[PDB]
Each structure stands twice: as C-alpha cells, then as structure tokens.
Amino acid sequence: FQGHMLFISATNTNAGKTTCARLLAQYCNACGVKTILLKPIETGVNDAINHSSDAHLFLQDNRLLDRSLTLKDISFYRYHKVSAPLIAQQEEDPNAPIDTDNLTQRLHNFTKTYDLVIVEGAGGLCVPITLEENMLDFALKLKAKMLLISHDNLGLINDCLLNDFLLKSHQLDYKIAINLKGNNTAFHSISLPYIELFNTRSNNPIVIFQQSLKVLMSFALKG
Amino acid sequence: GHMLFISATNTNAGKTTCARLLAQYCNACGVKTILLKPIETGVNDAINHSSDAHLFLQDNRLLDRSLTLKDISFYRYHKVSAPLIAQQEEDPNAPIDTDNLTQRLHNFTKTYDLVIVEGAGGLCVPITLEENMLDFALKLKAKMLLISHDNLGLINDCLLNDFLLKSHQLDYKIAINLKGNNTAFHSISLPYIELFNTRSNNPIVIFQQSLKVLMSFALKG
Ligand SMILES: Nc1ncnc2c1ncn2[C@@H]1O[C@H](COP(=O)(O)OP(=O)(O)O)[C@@H](O)[C@H]1O
Ligand SMILES: Nc1ncnc2c1ncn2[C@@H]1O[C@H](COP(=O)(O)OP(=O)(O)O)[C@@H](O)[C@H]1O
Ligand SMILES: NCCCCCCCC(=O)O
Ligand SMILES: NCCCCCCCC(=O)O
Ligand SMILES: [Cl-]
Ligand SMILES: [Cl-]
Ligand SMILES: [Mg+2]
Ligand SMILES: [Mg+2]
C-alpha cells in the first residue's frame, strides 16, 4: 500500500486551513478512508500552557484511529513567536534550521500506514520556512497535491486569483476551495458571481469547500 | 507627464491614504500632481461625501478649483463589490470601457507633471469580462506602486503580488503602509523583508520612509 498526500494551504493565515482540514478528514474517515492529520510546522504556540494549537486539535482527531499517538509524532517544529517559521526558528532555535528533507521522510512515512495523509502548512504559500524555501517549495518537494483554502469575504477574488496565478505556474495538482461561513448571506451576491464566471472559463474551477467534500476526497485520492 | 498607478495587497490596505500623502509631498516639491479614482465601488454620492474620489477632489482643487467629481472619477457604483459585478447589476448596458478610461487618464498628463491613478481593491480585481486592474495598469503603460498592509500575513501577500508583477513587463515598487503605532512589525515581519531585500533587485520599501524615493521612481524615465 502507498497512500496519498494532501497539502493544505491558504490565501493567508486565519483562513480556515485547520477547520477545513478536520472537516475533510472527518468525512474521509467516515467513508472508510483512513486519514491522518499533520501540522509539521507550527508557530505562535506555547505547549506548556495551552493545548488548543492546530497540532492538538489534530492529535485528538487522529487518536480515534491510533490512540498511541502523541503531539511530537504529528508536529515537529514548534515555536512561541507569532510569525513566519523562518523568523521564529532564527530567534528561538538559531542552531537548528528547519530540515525539509527530514520533514519529507516523516510525512511520507505516514503514507505507508494511512490511505490519506493531510498536511497543514502555516499561513500562506509564500511563507518562508528556511533561507531557501517556502511553504509552496515544501509542498512541491513532498510531491503532494494541493488544497488551497480561501476566506469568504470581500477581497477573496483578488486573493484566489493571485494564488491561482502562482499555483498554475508550477508543476502540481491543486484545487482552490472557499471556506464559506454558513451565516454569510452577502457572499452569494458579492463574490460568487465572478467565481461562477471564472469557472466557466477555467479548467481548474474554484469550488465551495463545504459543498465539495465528496469531490475533494476524490481529488485527494486520484492518481 | 508621468503616470503612477496605485494598487494594493487588497482593499482597505491604504491606497487612498498613501496616494494622498505622496501627492501632498509631490505638490509641495513643485511637482504638479493630480489624483484620480477612475473606477470606484461601494459609494452613494447622494448621502456620503467621503469616497476616495471626494477626498481626491478636495486635494485636486488646491491646483484647479474648477474640478468636479465627474472629472476625476468615471465609473461609480453603490454595490460593495468588484467593479465588473457592480457594473453588470447596476448598469448592464454599459460595460466599463478601458480604452475610454485610458484616453481620459492620459489626457491629464498633458497638463500635470504627475498623474496618480488609484485602482480598486487589488491587482486581479476584475473590471470587465476580459480585463482586471493589472491589465488596465498595463494598458495605461503606467508605473505601478503596490501598497501593502503592515500586519501579520504581509509577507505572503507581498510575495504573491511580487510574483505576479515580476511576471509582467512593467516597473513596479511594493511599499508597506506602516502605521506609526505599529511596534510589532519591526520584530514580526521586518526581518524577512530585510532578508528578502538583500536577495532581490526590486526591494520592498516602507512607504512612510520613502516619499522622496517614490517621487523619483514615479518621475523616472
Ligand atoms: N465555517 C466556519 N464557521 C465558524 N468558524 C470558522 C469556520 N471556518 C473557520 N472558522 C474559524 O475561523 C478561525 C480560522 O482558524 P483556522 O481554522 O485555524 O484557519 P487557519 O488554519 O487558516 O489559520 C478559527 O477560529 C475557526 O474556528
Ligand atoms: N498609515 C496609516 N495610518 C493610520 N491610518 C491609516 C493609514 N493608512 C490608511 N489609514 C486608514 O485606514 C483606512 C484604509 O483605507 P484606504 O487608505 O482607502 O485603503 P484603500 O484605499 O486601499 O481601500 C482608512 O480609513 C484610512 O484613514
Ligand atoms: N469598496 C472597495 C471594493 C473594491 C473591490 C473588492 C475586491 C474584490 C475581491 O478581490 O474579492
Ligand atoms: N500562526 C500563524 C502565523 C504563521 C503565518 C505567518 C505568515 C507570515 C507572513 O506572511 O507575514
Ligand atoms: Cl471528528
Ligand atoms: Cl494636502
Ligand atoms: Mg491553522
Ligand atoms: Mg481606497
């Protein structure tokens, strides 16, 4: 068995990566698709004090599959500073640059025992991890598939398209999904019309996450 | 005259404020500078007189008192949305004409040293079925000043835009709109910018610190 890998990134931080990741994993696992959730690099955390980081939320979902799992098993580079990882690393752990080769082995390792390995990035695509590498670079090195989450507010069109432009310029499979809040009545009149229009002319349509679980599972497992 | 297009990482980033600050500086230095907002959305001119165009109008009147809103802003809609969406809903029979707009903007270069043009929202914001703000800026053969917010997340937003801009044949600069009370920026984001700048031939500057530099940029041949 060789399992599949889905990288999850976003238009920016605080866009819905974590929530959507969980929602997708939940769906997959319910359909009998054995799915683990990973947050390899995380910043803005203090694990002595609080247990509500993305890695912690992931850990508790993952433990429904493998109770022996621990935080250190699914998250590897963790910093207090609320910043890009590179900046956090340099300040808090100067002698230990983030090793993407290491990270890759570890993420791939999970594909040996899981049908689907979901990997949450940090912040957006151009967020720097090392002197030489950013999150997009990392996703490419992993040879993973890309799910890019967008916010659902005024300004999403610009953000989606900027990211579309960057992604389509690189050799990877990707989908862009909008994280639509249920109570967001404005979206369907304000943004959705351009998205519809954009989709008629694009071979890589932008979908609405909450309405695309089945479609996105398929995408994730395609090969 | 010279033409500077002003866009941003997104809407509500500081285009209007920075545009005014730059015009103010220019005009003070004897560089005759007009401020234009050709396309604007989310406005209701009967009720509210604080639109970007209105602010521009009152600045512009220090140079030419006869000027009126309709002279410096041409497509204006109530809907708080991308212009294309606003147009289709509010004025279906009148697509935005970028050829027209270009004439009208260029026209001002005849009588002004510098013509500053505020876009709407960001670069990929659609104006017509075929064209977005970046397209428009290219058609204008204008120079590009892209304003960025100063918050957590600016790196990503700056670089995304850098990527898109550097992929096209235009001169541009990216300026961070740094709030004066923003102590966090200097330790949270600035380090990466400095680092980025050491390795890029198109460094990211801090707007409030770069008025003279940006004026020069705007007037360079
Ligand atoms: N559909 C939704 N309804 C309510 N809150 C949401 C929804 N999607 C995301 N959020 C909230 O918005 C915030 C975004 O954080 P997160 O899911 O961690 O995004 P990111 O991983 O991109 O930082 C969280 O507090 C989360 O609970
Ligand atoms: N450097 C700054 N310092 C303090 N307030 C600012 C600064 N730049 C913009 N603002 C304020 O924040 C808001 C940003 O809006 P604006 O400048 O119109 O953004 P945009 O033109 O990109 O939509 C305005 O209300 C403005 O007064
Ligand atoms: N009031 C200013 C609104 C300008 C257009 C909004 C940007 C659309 C988007 O990128 O989703
Ligand atoms: N915990 C979220 C913080 C990590 C993302 C910071 C993004 C850096 C930037 O693009 O300026
Ligand atoms: Cl669950
Ligand atoms: Cl003034
Ligand atoms: Mg998260
Ligand atoms: Mg404005």
Count CB atoms within 10 A of the CB of residue A38. Answer: 26
A89 burial via Cβ count (<10 Å: 0-12, 13-18, 19+): buried
Q: Parallel, antiparallel, or unpaired for β B143-148 and B172-176? A: parallel
- Please give the distance, rounded to the nearest whole angstrom, from the Cα atom of residue A19 to the centre of ligand 1: 5
- How was this one solved? X-ray
State the sign of the Cα–Cα–Cα–Cα dihedral A95, A99, A103, A105. Answer: negative
Q: Which residue of A has its CA nearest to B158?
A: A126
Instruction: Provide φ and ψ at B154, rounded to 5°.
Output: -65, -35
Whether the CB-CB separation of A141 and A100 falls below 8 Å is answered with yes
| Cα–Cα distance, B191 to B56 (Å, whole number) | 35
Q: Residue B53, SS3?
A: helix
| Cα–Cα distance, B161 to A166 (Å, whole number) | 9
To what resolution in angstroms was this structure determined? Answer: 2.8
| Cα–Cα distance, B94 to B84 (Å, whole number) | 11
Query: Does residue A44 line the site of ligand 4, with CB under 6 A?
Result: yes
Whether the CB-CB separation of B124 and B22 falls below 8 Å is answered with no
Mutate which of B155, B183, B196, B200 to disrupt the A interface (most A C-beta within 10 Å)? B155
What is the DSSP annotation of A5-28? EEEEEESSTTSSHHHHHHHHHHHH
CA dist B174 to A13, A196, B210, Å? 21, 31, 11
Q: Which of B37, B139, B143, B220 is catalytic?
A: B37
The alpha carbon of residue A211 is apart from the nearest alpha carbon of chain B, in Å, by: 23
- Please give the distance, rounded to the nearest whole angstrom, from the Cα atom of residue B61 to the centre of ligand 7: 49
Whether the CB-CB separation of B175 and A30 falls below 8 Å is answered with no
Does A82 contact chain B (CB < 8 Å)? yes
Domains of chain A: 1-223 (3.40.50.300)
Indicate the Cα dihedral angle A116, A122, A127, A130, nearest 10°.
Answer: -80
| Cα–Cα distance, A130 to A138 (Å, whole number) | 10
Active site residue A168: no
Q: Residue B144, SS3?
A: strand
DSSP state for residue B126 in the 8-state scheme: B
CA dist B33 to A160, B80, B205, Å? 34, 29, 22
Q: Which of A39, A143, A168, A175 is catalytic?
A: A39
| Cα–Cα distance, A20 to A23 (Å, whole number) | 5
CB within 8 Å: B79 and A124: no
Q: Which two tokens stand for residue A59?
A: 């850990």
Give all strands (DSSP E) within A16-106, no chain letters.
Answer: 35-38, 41-42, 77-78
Whether the CB-CB separation of A107 and A38 falls below 8 Å is answered with yes
Does A195 contact chain B (CB < 8 Å)? no
Whether the CB-CB separation of B181 and B43 falls below 8 Å is answered with no
Single-letter residue type at B88? Q
Helix axes A17-30, A54-62, angle to 10 degrees: 10
What is the DSSP annotation of B150-218? -STTHHHHHHHHHHHHHTSSS-EEEEE---TT--THHHHTHHHHHHHHHT-SS--EEGGG-HHHHHHHH
Rg of chain B over Cα atoms, rounded to whole angstroms, equals: 17
Helix axes B190-198, B154-166, angle to 10 degrees: 30
Q: How many CA atoms lie within 13 A of B86 on its CB side?
A: 20
Q: Which two tokens stand for residue A178?
A: 């909008």
CA dist A57 to A28, A62, A106, Å? 17, 9, 20
Does B81 contact chain A (CB < 8 Å)? yes
Indicate the residue of A13, A157, A169 with minimum beta-carbon distance to B124: A157
